[PDB]
Symmetry: C2
């Protein structure tokens, strides 16, 4: 149901800006994600650019921005880091600690200095004080959950032509094309306990609850900004049970709280999935086994009035799950872990519905249109369990 | 000129090369796509291995293993590679970043290779052990934190994925780009003489070639000479900082500088590889300017056609020759973040010594190592700095 929205953000939160993974080797991670996701390299900051502290590669597709960063070892001169908050020692420990993982969830805000200030005044634990990067660009960080930080980035609307962040050199893509992913939809974190994680996070941002799924194996709650275009869910495990909670399994292998999955939206998910799946065999990402025709007979009954046989067929061929909503239709699919451990994975989706306008010809879509796959949980759990037992 | 055939143990050929990292999935995936080597075997949590995640890529006879250690809830006993040590691997990655940890050769008897090696000076790294099904493994120190690994197994075991404990992975939707075998693997050390004395000393590998130019080099080889393992040391002086020292500096010690991978049709191979550079594959050294190709016409116009020279020029491949042999070669830019490890793609033309029946055995090293191209090499990187 639609939960009330008290529009209580403590600072103006515009939208997701980017995500940064602190890696063992940026070249490797960025390189694989670039062809695996169809996100050409767009900016860079490394030795070739005068940064001898860290190597950073920014991949982009539509409005999706993925930053991959790794520390140099010797001859490293910290003062040359394009990202002032970088810590070689911290990064090195991060990589050994979790393998491939998300370090920063960055949101564009009206003013990074005021967002930090209002955040710390409301309990946020500071991670990196506000600094100017140049051209009206500001950055600040506070602790989100575990060793993941919530990063604030602000700049004049007129500076949006910047490749990424000051200090980053733009990279052109002439012999390059994307697969259709356009934006981050939601970023989910796993914590040992929801309430305290939620109280701290909602308490310093003013973000409100948009949705919740409670019980197997987990309790989830989605937090959103005023306009609800920024969605940050949190999961906690449910103890006891039969098999170990999939949430606990992550905390165990990951070694603590962290980003579990990131949902990436496409406006034509079928075209996008075909491109990704064509790359699976040679280093790309793999997807969860497609459900069986029974599941799909069910989608014909559940939503045969929005998808066409040739579409539902495509869905079954790729392994896409389909959910219906009081006001929208959701197509979603999950990849297998993108790193060495069964921790971080990706979700690819497309939302159908909830379109409206704002005195302009551009028709915007309501955030979270179609839900989060509540109807598919049953199947998702069965696919996960089966694969689990399959791993014995 | 003289092959003393002094091997202290039976060295059959290159078996695989293992790179250690904190993140093997990323490295393996990028390399798979960049080299055209589909996944052929794995050993990890999904196979009962909670100590390390290992991925084996393969193209023809080339085998690349990528390994990273698990951090929490790990059982060391479950390692498929008994020599693996989590703490040593973590330290290795923080020290060198993405790099080659092991150069593995297939030998007659791994135990015999080890015993014969330490009997002659080798620093032991891991004692011989039986992995099961006739498979044996041992390791000794090569240079720095890189080890020379020995594996052995009966010709009937060849019917298995990799080493016991590794699960085979089928690649129905996967095709390679023509890379078929390792040609040579080069290590950089601070001082050549002692390192080469040590290395040639415990293996019995003889000196195949030598280049005394800012670096000096010796190429050691096994009896059949199908295993070539060169060494470089930097020569200090003049102005420019030795590219060999740059490696040592950024890498933090001795280590593998480059691996030359051979293809039977390198032009065909390079087109596939270069078509993927823009999307995460590997980048190469910018092509030499046309005057260089005016040069290969002059120097190899008798063995290569105009169409073939232009193809080389489009791809940026360098050409060189010796007596009875032609070498085609190209260098990629660093494969990881640090200006250290890189790859060399080549094809050797000639030295097809046979008894009139058909192509079956080419002498190793046919065409040299690119001596005639060093000057273009110095110029290509100079053109990089002189283009910030
Ligand atoms: Fe999701
Ligand atoms: Fe070479």
């Amino acid at each position: 149901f639609v939960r009330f929205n008290p529009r209580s953000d403590r600072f103006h939160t515009l939208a997701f800006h980017h995500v940064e993974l602190w890696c063992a080797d940026a070249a490797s991670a960025a390189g694989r994600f670039s062809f695996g996701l169809g996100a050409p390299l767009a900016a860079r900051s490394d030795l070739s650019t005068g940064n001898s502290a860290h190597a950073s590669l920014l991949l982009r597709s539509g409005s999706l921005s993925f930053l991959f960063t790794a520390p140099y070892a010797h001859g490293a001169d910290a003062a040359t880091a394009a990202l002032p908050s970088f810590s070689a020692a911290a990064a090195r420990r991060f990589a050994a600690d979790h393998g491939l993982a998300v370090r920063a969830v960055a949101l564009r805000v009206a003013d990074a200095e005021d967002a930090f200030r209002a955040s710390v005044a409301a309990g946020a634990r500071p991670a990196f004080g506000p600094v100017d990067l140049g051209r009206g660009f500001r950055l600040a960080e506070v602790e989100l959950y575990g060793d993941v930080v919530l990063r604030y980035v602000s700049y004049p609307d007129g500076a949006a032509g910047e490749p990424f962040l000051p200090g980053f050199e733009g990279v052109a893509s002439p012999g390059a094309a994307d697969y259709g992913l356009s934006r981050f939809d939601h970023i989910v974190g796993n914590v040992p306990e929801l309430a305290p994680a939620a109280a701290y996070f909602a308490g310093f941002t003013g973000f409100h609850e948009f949705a919740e799924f409670t019980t197997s194996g987990l309790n989830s709650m989605v937090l959103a900004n005023n306009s609800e275009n920024v969605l940050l869910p949190l999961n906690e495990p449910v103890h006891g049970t039969k098999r170990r909670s999939q949430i606990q399994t992550f905390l165990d292998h990951h070694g603590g709280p962290g980003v579990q999955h990131m949902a990436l939206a496409s406006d034509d998910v079928l075209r996008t999935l075909r491109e990704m799946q064509a790359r699976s065999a040679m280093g790309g990402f793999e997807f969860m086994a497609p459900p069986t025709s029974d599941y799909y007979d069910g989608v014909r009954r559940r939503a045969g009035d929005v998808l066409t046989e040739a579409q539902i067929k495509e869905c079954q061929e790729l392994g896409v799950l389909v959910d219906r909503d009081d006001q929208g239709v959701l197509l979603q699919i999950f990849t297998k872990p993108v790193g060495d451990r069964p921790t971080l994975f990706l979700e690819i989706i497309q939302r159908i519905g909830c379109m409206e306008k704002d005195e302009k010809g551009q028709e915007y879509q309501k955030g979270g249109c179609g839900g989060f796959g509540k109807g598919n949980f049953s199947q998702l759990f069965k696919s996960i369990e089966d694969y689990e037992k399959s791993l014995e």
